[PDB]
A paper describes a structure:
To elucidate the structural basis of the PTPδ–IL1RAPL1 interaction for trans-synaptic adhesion, we determined the crystal structures of IL1RAPL1-ECD in complex with PTPδ Ig1-Ig2 and the full-length PTPδ-ECD at 2.7 and 4.4 Å resolutions, respectively. Description of PTPδ Ig1-Ig2 will be based on the 2.7-Å-complex structure, whereas that of the other regions of PTPδ-ECD will be based on the 4.4-Å-complex structure. The Ig1-Ig2 domains of PTPδ retain the binding ability for IL1RAPL1-ECD, as shown in our serial deletion analysis of PTPδ. No substantial change in the backbone structure of PTPδ Ig1-Ig2 occurred upon binding to IL1RAPL1. The interface between the IL1RAPL Ig1 and PTPδ Ig2 domains comprises both hydrophobic and hydrophilic interactions with a buried surface area of 699 Å2. These interactions occur on two β-strands comprising Arg181–Ser187 and Arg196–Glu202 in the Ig2 domain of PTPδ, between which meA9 is inserted. The first eight residues of meA9 (188Glu-Ser-Ile-Gly-Gly-Thr-Pro-Ile195) form a loop connecting these two β-strands, whereas the last residue, Arg196, extends one of the two β-strands. Trp34 of IL1RAPL1 hydrophobically interacts with Leu153, Ala198 and Leu185 of PTPδ. The Arg196 side chain forms a hydrogen bond with Asp37 of IL1RAPL1, which is further stabilized by a hydrogen bond with Tyr59 of IL1RAPL1. The IL1RAPL1 Ig3–PTPδ Ig1 interface is overlapped with the putative binding pocket for glycosaminoglycan chains of heparan sulfate and chondroitin sulfate proteoglycans, which mediate axonal growth control though the interaction with the type-IIa RPTPs19. This third interface is formed primarily by hydrophilic interactions: a positively charged cluster comprising Arg75, Arg95 and Arg98 of PTPδ forms a hydrogen bond network with a negatively charged cluster comprising Glu291 and Asp292 of IL1RAPL1.
Vertebrate type-IIa RPTPs comprise LAR, PTPσ and PTPδ, which share common domain architecture with a single transmembrane (TM) helix flanked by a large extracellular domain (ECD) and cytoplasmic tandem PTP domains: the membrane-proximal PTP domain (D1) is catalytically active, whereas the membrane-distal PTP domain (D2) is inactive. In mammals, presynaptic type-IIa RPTPs form trans-synaptic adhesion by specifically binding to their cognate postsynaptic organizers through their ECDs for inducing synaptic differentiation of neurons. To date, five different types of postsynaptic organizers for type-IIa RPTPs have been reported: interleukin-1 receptor (IL-1R) accessory protein (IL-1RAcP)7, IL-1RAcP-like-1 (IL1RAPL1)8, neurotrophin receptor tyrosine kinase C (TrkC), netrin-G ligand-3 (NGL-3)1011 and Slit- and Trk-like (Slitrk) family proteins. To elucidate the structural basis for decoding the ‘splice-insert signaling code' in the type-IIa RPTPs, we determined the crystal structures of PTPδ-ECD in complex with IL-1RAcP-ECD and IL1RAPL1-ECD.
Author numbering:
A (entry chain A): 28 to 236
B (entry chain B): 31 to 352
Write the structure that this text describes.
């Protein structure tokens, strides 16, 4: 038996009213730790707050949609626990009004679109975003973050080499498509000013001819 | 080969007008321009796809209509069978990258000079100035007064009022009126071909400077709704919103300090916002509060809240036993 230890801690977010915010928390231990989301010590409970579990059981995502200001603006915490031990990590949510949005906040110039790929062929979701500073593009599938961490993986992330003037191009490339890849993908643009979500796009996988 | 799929910029044109398709990779994806790619010993090739996923026979360029100029493809003129995706490939022996480019070739809508599903869209506020531009004309641009670009309204010539000012590729309306709604068409000669671009104009009220206006219920009276224990209660709030842009209206119920939308319950809940009236671009909207089996705890003050960039306003209702 080992106590819970974090493999992924949530980071502070600055979102925009009516939009989405996702907090990620993953831990490991023996037995498998449970994860709970709190605000001021109290487990969150709210129609607009959804906790989505990883298939691994490695953790959960706290998703707030649509964002409301100033109610949602607060300090939240992830708490991981089993009978051997307990660990927690805090995180801040900030929500701005669109009228309040600064020059240099990420915008989605174009977001992913409905795509139908047959099984085992490559499917690509495209995202174009801009901002100052230049935004990082990340991906979420069915409310969980797409992991492109490992190179030589089935799923890879492409990034525009970037001349100054145009939006940044980002893509999610899924080789050897399978039925489990089917789902609702959304692109996410982030910089030091904040975070913005594209609209959702479904990927369908039809049978190989 | 690292594939970027279909580029964001799409080309849609009327069968018979010239169109030049630039390779997207230089104009976004990669840092360098075309000449430098060649100098550095990279190849540029064009292939044509019928759609996703159909796979690509190379382009059979002649030299007249479908020429393969420097960093782009030129069509002179466009043909109907030219519709499709045009993959733009770049190569080392150790490096490859390609993007596909959409090209749609439509027909005049019957009796009209545009194609409906093939149009630009703009918006303007009443009493303010709007500028419509002719685009994308970069290539058919000429540095002389003639030929000049002709503007149609509903695909017909009209005597333009003088408040409307014309420059080279733009049309200026110094004060937008409800009459100015509709389909504007620019026409250019070059080739000699004919290039036409239509933008549809929708008009809205100016950006309001006042908060929204409560109707059901009112901002002063404490209206009262009667209900029985163990019944259902639909407390409907109805409000007016001026034009504040592409933002959705923020109308919501509370109960004291408690927001309804923040309650995980099957007993109480707000409905979805209803848009009851919409007119350029001012709305009357409705959101309702439902309680399904009236407990005694339910009774009491509910207040409907209504917000805008200019302010927050609320009106209260008292729920009470028969
Ligand atoms: C909560 O209450 C509102 C108020 O409507 C009611 O109207 C009368 C008939 C009386 O019963 C009143 O006591 C009460 O105020 C309900 O809103 C209404 O919803 C209906 C849809 O079910 C709308 O009717 C039409 O439906 C047809 C489809 O057959 C459409 O084509 C029409 O365009 C229109 O939508 C109606 O306009 C709407 N009225 C208002 C004022 O909002 C509501 O259904 C009810 N329950 C909720 C919100 O859960
Ligand atoms: C293959 O080409 C790359 C250089 O890629 C670029 O190609 C064009 C798109 C344009 O952007 C040019 O200006 C570039 O040259 C070569 O790899 C590069 O090698 C340099 C060596 O210092 C290195 O700094 C770069 O990071 C390399 N680029 C990449 C993408 O790895 C490579 O040598 C070429 N191969 C052959 C056989 O010529
Ligand atoms: C501008 O053109 C559009 C079509 O491109 C017109 O929209 C049509 O309006 C009629 C009104 O009865 C409808 O029956 C059609 O279905 C509409 N077509 C489309 C594609 O929306 C519109 O009327 C024109 N604007 C003006 C001011 O005449
Ligand atoms: C683009 O190519 C031109 C030659 O046409 C060259 O002069 C220029 O250096 C290139 N661009 C940049 C940013 O250097
Ligand atoms: C093509 O557009 C012109 C407008 O210049 C119109 O007169 C003509 O009728 C259109 N063609 C058809 C087949 O409707």
């Amino acid at each position: 038996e080992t106590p819970p230890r974090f493999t992924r801690t949530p980071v502070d977010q600055t979102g925009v009213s009516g939009g989405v915010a996702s907090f990620i928390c993953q831990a490991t231990g023996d037995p498998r730790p449970k994860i709970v989301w709190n605000k001021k010590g109290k487990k969150v409970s709210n129609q607009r707050f959804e906790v989505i579990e990883f298939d691994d059981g490695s953790g959960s995502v706290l998703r707030i949609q649509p964002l409301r200001t100033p109610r949602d603006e607060a300090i939240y915490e992830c708490v991981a626990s089993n009978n051997v031990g307990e660990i927690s990590v805090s995180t801040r949510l900030t929500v701005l009004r669109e009228d309040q949005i600064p020059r240099g906040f990420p915008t989605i110039d174009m977001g992913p679109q409905l795509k139908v790929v047959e099984r085992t062929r490559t499917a690509t979701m495209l995202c174009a975003a801009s901002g100052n500073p230049d935004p990082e593009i990340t991906w979420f599938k069915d409310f969980l973050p797409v992991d492109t961490s490992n190179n030589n993986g089935r799923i890879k992330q492409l990034r525009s080499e970037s001349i100054g003037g145009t939006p940044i191009r980002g893509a999610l490339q899924i080789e050897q498509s399978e039925e489990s890849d089917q789902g609702k993908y959304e692109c996410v643009a982030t910089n030091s000013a904040g975070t913005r979500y594209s609209a959702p796009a479904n990927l369908y996988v039809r049978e190989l001819r | 080969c690292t594939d970027w799929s279909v580029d964001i910029k799409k080309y849609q044109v009327l069968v018979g007008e010239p169109v030049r398709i630039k390779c997207a990779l230089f104009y976004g994806y990669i840092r360098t321009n075309y000449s430098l790619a060649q100098s550095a010993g990279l190849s540029l090739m064009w292939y044509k796809s019928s759609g996703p996923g159909d796979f690509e026979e190379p382009i059979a360029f002649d030299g007249s209509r479908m020429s393969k100029e420097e960093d782009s493809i030129w069509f002179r003129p466009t043909l109907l069978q030219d519709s499709g995706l045009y993959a733009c490939v770049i190569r080392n022996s150790t490096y490859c990258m390609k993007v596909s480019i959409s090209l749609t070739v439509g027909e005049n809508d019957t009796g009209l000079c545009y194609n409906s599903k093939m149009k630009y869209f703009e918006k303007a506020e009443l009493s303010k100035s709007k500028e419509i531009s002719c685009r994308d004309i970069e290539d058919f641009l000429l540095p002389t007064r003639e030929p000049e670009i002709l503007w149609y309204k509903e695909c017909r010539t009209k005597a333009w009022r003088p408040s409307i000012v014309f420059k080279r590729d733009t049309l200026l309306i110094k004060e937008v009126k409800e009459d100015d709604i509709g389909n504007y068409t620019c026409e250019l000669k070059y080739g000699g071909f004919v290039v036409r671009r239509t933008t549809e104009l929708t008009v809205t009220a100016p950006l309001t400077d006042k908060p929204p206006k409560l109707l059901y219920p009112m901002e002063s009276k404490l209206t009262v709704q009667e209900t029985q224990l163990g019944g259902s209660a639909n407390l409907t709030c109805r409000a007016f919103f001026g034009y504040s842009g592409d933002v959705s209206p923020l109308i919501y119920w509370m109960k004291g300090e408690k927001f309804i939308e923040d309650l995980d319950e099957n007993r109480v809940w707000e409905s979805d916002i209803r848009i009851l009236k919409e007119h350029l671009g001012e709305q009357e909207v409705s959101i309702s509060l439902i309680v399904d089996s009236v407990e005694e705890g339910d009774l009491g003050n509910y207040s409907c809240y209504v917000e805008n960039g200019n302010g927050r306003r609320h009106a209260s209702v008292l729920l009470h036993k028969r």
